[PDB]
Structure 1
Amino acid sequence: RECKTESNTFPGICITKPPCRKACISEKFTDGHCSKILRRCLCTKPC
């Protein structure tokens, strides 16, 4: 659970958590945020 994978659904740069949030929800995840490496929506899935 909580596997780190960038949102493939997210069509851009991680500007804000709100858009990233729903991107992870639509996909097979639960949470999402900006990855502290670059600036992509890093979603977490209940793997």
Structure 2
Amino acid sequence: RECKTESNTFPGICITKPPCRKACISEKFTDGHCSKILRRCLCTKPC
């Protein structure tokens, strides 16, 4: 079970994974991915 929380530190719209994952890991999540429509960096971690 993992929960999604928008990244607090990623700048701008999310198009490619690497900078979003990096931001999320910097924030102590375990991954980050881009959403399709609002194009947000969403971090995930177990919850």
**TM-score greater than 0.5 by the shorter chain:** yes
Give the TM-score normalised by the residue count of structure 1. Answer: 0.81
Deviating above 3 A after TM superposition, structure 1's stretches of 4 or more consecutive aligned residues are: none
* Separation in 1, partners of 2:28, 2:46: 8
Structure 2, gaps ≥5 residues long: none
Q: Return the TM-score normalized by structure 2.
A: 0.81
% identical aligned pairs: 100
Question: Alpha-carbon deviations, 1:3-46, whole Å to 9, x = none?
Answer: 10011110111021000010010002111111234100011023
Gaps of 5+ in 1: none
